[PDB]
Design a protein around this nucleic acid. Sequence first.
RNA 1: UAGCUAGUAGGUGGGGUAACGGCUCACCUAGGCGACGAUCCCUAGCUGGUCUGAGAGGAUGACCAGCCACACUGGAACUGA
RNA 2: CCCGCAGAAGAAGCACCGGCUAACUCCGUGCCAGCAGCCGCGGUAAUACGGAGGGUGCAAGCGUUAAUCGGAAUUACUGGGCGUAAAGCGCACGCAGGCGGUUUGUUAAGUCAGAUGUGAAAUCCCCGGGCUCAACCUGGGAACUGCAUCUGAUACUGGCAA
Lengths: 82, 205, 157, 80, 123, 32, 129
Amino acid sequence: MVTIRLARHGAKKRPFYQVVVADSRNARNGRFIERVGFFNPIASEKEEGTRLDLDRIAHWVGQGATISDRVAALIKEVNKAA
Amino acid sequence: ARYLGPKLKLSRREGTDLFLKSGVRAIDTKCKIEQAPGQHGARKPRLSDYGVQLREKQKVRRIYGVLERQFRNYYKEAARLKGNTGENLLALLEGRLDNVVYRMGFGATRAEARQLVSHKAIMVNGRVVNIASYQVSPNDVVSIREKAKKQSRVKAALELAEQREKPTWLEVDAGKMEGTFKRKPERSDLSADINEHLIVELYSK
Amino acid sequence: ELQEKLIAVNRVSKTVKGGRIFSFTALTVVGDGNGRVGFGYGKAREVPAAIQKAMEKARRNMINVALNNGTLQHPVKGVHTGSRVFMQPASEGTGIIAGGAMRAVLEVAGVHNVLAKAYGSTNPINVVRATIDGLENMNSPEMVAAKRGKSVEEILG
Amino acid sequence: KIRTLQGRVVSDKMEKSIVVAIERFVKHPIYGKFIKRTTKLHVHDENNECGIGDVVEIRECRPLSKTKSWTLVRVVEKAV
Amino acid sequence: ATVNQLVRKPRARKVAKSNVPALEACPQKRGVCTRVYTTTPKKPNSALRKVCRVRLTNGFEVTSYIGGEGHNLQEHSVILIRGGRVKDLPGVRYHTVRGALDCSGVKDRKQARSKYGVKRPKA
Amino acid sequence: EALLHDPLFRQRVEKNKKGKGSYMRKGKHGNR
Amino acid sequence: SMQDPIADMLTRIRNGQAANKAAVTMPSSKLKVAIANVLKEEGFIEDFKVEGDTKPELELTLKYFQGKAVVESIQRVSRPGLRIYKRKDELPKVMAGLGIAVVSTSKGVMTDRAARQAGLGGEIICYVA
RNA sequence: UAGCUAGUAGGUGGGGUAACGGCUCACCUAGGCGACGAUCCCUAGCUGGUCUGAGAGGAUGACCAGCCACACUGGAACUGA
RNA sequence: CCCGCAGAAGAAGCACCGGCUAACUCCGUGCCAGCAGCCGCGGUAAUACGGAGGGUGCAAGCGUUAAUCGGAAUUACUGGGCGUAAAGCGCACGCAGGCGGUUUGUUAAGUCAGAUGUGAAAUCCCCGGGCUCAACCUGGGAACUGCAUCUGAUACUGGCAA
Ligand SMILES: [Mg+2]
Ligand SMILES: [Mg+2]
Ligand SMILES: [Mg+2]
Ligand SMILES: [Mg+2]
Ligand SMILES: [Mg+2]
Ligand SMILES: [Mg+2]
Ligand SMILES: [Mg+2]
Ligand SMILES: [Mg+2]
Ligand SMILES: [Mg+2]
Ligand SMILES: [Mg+2]
Ligand SMILES: [Mg+2]
Ligand SMILES: [Mg+2]
Ligand SMILES: [Mg+2]
Ligand SMILES: [Mg+2]
Ligand SMILES: [Mg+2]
Ligand SMILES: [Mg+2]
Ligand SMILES: [Mg+2]
Ligand SMILES: [Mg+2]
Ligand SMILES: [Mg+2]
Ligand SMILES: [Mg+2]
Ligand SMILES: [Mg+2]
Ligand SMILES: [Mg+2]
Ligand SMILES: [Mg+2]
Ligand SMILES: [Mg+2]
């Protein structure tokens, strides 16, 4: 089915995940329907480490897409508002 | 990735002092300088069309100690940026770190200014940085770390920098060993012996 | 100051009944540095005797050309004897980017930013006659508005 | 809406089928001319509704026979 | 030149041919080197140019030029063929890398030793 | 014979510097 | 065989300058008068006359300024064998703005900046320099 | 490399596929495509892009990514969404 | 990534130097060796060959070869030519095709303007930000020159009628 997961971009030991909406049978970086926000596990104390378009994420939950477990924790970390 | 050779032989090919050997004695006080640059250098050259643009470019590289692979990369950013590409090159060569340290008087030579930078003795914006190519951002502070406090060069060079012109786009604090980087340097405010227009024409060949 | 400049020097021949006598042509361009130029062409039996001779004719053909603080007003073409010289104003094009024998004219003209390309032949004598014809054929905004329209700011925009 | 397409009949010698010819003024890529260009399509009809040399309103319908997926609507400005 | 005549027949620049038919996009080729011999150049020059007729790997049999002063080749030697025309011997359009596979470097060379494969004076 | 009819052993004529067939366009150097 | 009567208008203008003449005559057409009105508005030409009833003989009057030709570099761009249609942003600048470029647009013929002022483009007829 | 094709262009009816269709049969009609280049031969994965170039273009499309194709060779079918 | 421990102690080669294209004159050889990308250098007084000294250009890289593009306006759409340099069918008629005087009305395919959908992401550029700075990584945007549909302008081209 459709899923909301992560795409390990970045460099050697400097990862960067782009939250994408893709079919579950893909190659993690390949064919995706729509990328929605990102995530930076090595982010600074700066203003931006995680952006999520929650309107679109909640739009895909209604369509039946399943959220990955690392992605599900980011909804808890953002606390749905801030 | 450095020159590592006779310093003022580079000035002899140009015929002018490039300040890269300067302490107190002007120009050897003796034999030959600002003259014959080799064995057959007593014979005057003819200075062809390529060579006039070449020796103009080589002079600027011998000043700041930048190699050709690196200097051409400054030209890429200088040409892509707005404004006068001939002016932005001397802007980016000015913002280079070892130049900034040399303009403070913290080191008495652009080579010596690299010696202080490379041996992690200078904290720009509070953070120790050993990159000689560090492009210094505007409205920033440069400072000497405590391990280089009065370590026999900082005192000797800063007192030597009293015969300088004390560059207007900077604020050095001789007695607190901390510098302050003011605005971007204006084109007319630097050395002005350099025909910057001969450089841009060379790489645009 | 008048900025003398040497461009090319050859060795032409004559073929008299005994042997051949070599004259040395010398093509020089002079120019003040403010849109005034001039090229001298002269030959003599000696090399330095001709460059002095080409200085003399250079000051006789002084031509005034308008320029916009160091560059052209508008792009212009410069056809003369198989030389299809093209010039671009290059508003801060940063450099006199032009070939041999087309550079030296625009230097002493007092021009600093041009883009140019010598199409066709690259004969030094004709490419100098190309730009000298090419620069004097260029107008000025006040010179065009003096002809028609009668307002320099109204015609331009 | 409907997305019709107009073309002229190039041949009508078939049974319950007609090949049409649509002209289209294409701008040539490399050069700059607006050259002329044809197109042949096998239009389906009812009996023999259009004759020869007539313009006709065509609409792309469901796929009929082998390389034949066009159908006419009207035969405007017919053989007379 | 009539743009309506160009739509009918486009501009067609003839493709420039390679100077060396040495199995395209192969910088070096391996040789078998049958019949090392020496020839004389065309009318302006004069020497005994040392060459060899190489049976290449891919199947061609070309003649290549032996660079350097004095060679160590023989009736069978596996040399390495480098492109390059001499324009002084008719038909020689390849050079031989001195210091490769079996063809050794030159003797007593100091100025340009990367060319002709001499290592370095170890004194 | 064959060891003399080799294409090497041919009468070599030298271009004299002055006289018949002496002209050069530019010579060994063209320094201007 | 007069397949482009517009370029027949420009040629008379170009040759009239080289011939040091005063006026140039031609058979009129509404597109010809419309272009000349653009040439009059800019000042390249001098007060045309459209005299004629059934065979309208259009008469421009040439202009010279300092004993030299005013219209010195004129050429038709959108030839009938090859038509050029520039959009709003692809509209040229003849002589870096010093020369005009007569372009027929939806509102009518107007200069290249006047079409750019109205924010529309079309068939660029001629470059006048 | 100037004609190529005869299930080939089309119609009705039967059958078949998840689905339309000569996809496949029977009968009838004799057409369909072609100089804006059909068939034939050689060569080749396509593209986003990459290199170069003032632009326009030319050349090439490894790595990253989408799609197609293939899985010792040729052929077919079953299980199964 | 910081802190501490020594004597500058472990860290410089490569091509070139006749012109093009930055940089020389002395030995050895003597159209013999050899150099080469091209023009051409070597004939017992070489700045082109082979060493030495001295320089130049690059520098943990430097040269050579292979390959594409550029200089090539030497396939020219932007941007060439054809009396003599390569190039006007020997001539004429003529279908397809290309183009076509002038006026009015009309339509609205070509054309122009706006909007929507799409033009995947990453790349190519623009301001930002983060790895000590850069390379790289990355946010937003522009762009993706296109195509289709819808709503207008409708002068010019095309169609139709007179
Ligand atoms: Mg490096
Ligand atoms: Mg004269
Ligand atoms: Mg089918
Ligand atoms: Mg059926
Ligand atoms: Mg059925
Ligand atoms: Mg180009
Ligand atoms: Mg391809
Ligand atoms: Mg692979
Ligand atoms: Mg691939
Ligand atoms: Mg296998
Ligand atoms: Mg030199
Ligand atoms: Mg030597
Ligand atoms: Mg040395
Ligand atoms: Mg080439
Ligand atoms: Mg080209
Ligand atoms: Mg030509
Ligand atoms: Mg004839
Ligand atoms: Mg004949
Ligand atoms: Mg008409
Ligand atoms: Mg017509
Ligand atoms: Mg549109
Ligand atoms: Mg980005
Ligand atoms: Mg657009
Ligand atoms: Mg009619």
